[PDB]
Design a protein around this nucleic acid. Sequence first.
RNA 1: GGGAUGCUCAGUGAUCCUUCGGGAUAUCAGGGCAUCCC
Length: 129
Amino acid sequence: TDPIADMLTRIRNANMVRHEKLEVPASKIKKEIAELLKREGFIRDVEYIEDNKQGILRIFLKYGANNERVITGLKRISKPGLRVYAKADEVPRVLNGLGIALVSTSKGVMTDKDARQLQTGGEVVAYVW
RNA sequence: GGGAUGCUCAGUGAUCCUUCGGGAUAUCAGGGCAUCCC
């Protein structure tokens, strides 16, 4: 069972059917992931919806001029039962820089460019392009 | 009993950095407390 993979799937599906928005149970790691996508321009918005359970992340997807989808793909990389780890010179490049690798470092979850910047490795959580 | 979360502790077990002395703590795995679900 893999909540992060679930989120990427719900986003992939919504994006196919070109939905405006979607929702996932909130967790801190998924919060961070959604925030990165916003800050990298892959989604239009994310917000936290209160529910006295564990919260909801409502994500607003992004489509371009003539309904061009801004997101092309999402890949779960690291997994429960097979974690994926990069040293700071081995942090993957997604589509020669046109995509992003989401990396969990001891200084938070950031892009692959941020990782190489800070000179750090970590868990390679996912790919978006 | 099993899941899913949050606050917190520690840190080498995993992982990362290192001038090899040490250092980081997001995630994984530990400790404590707490909420929600079957």
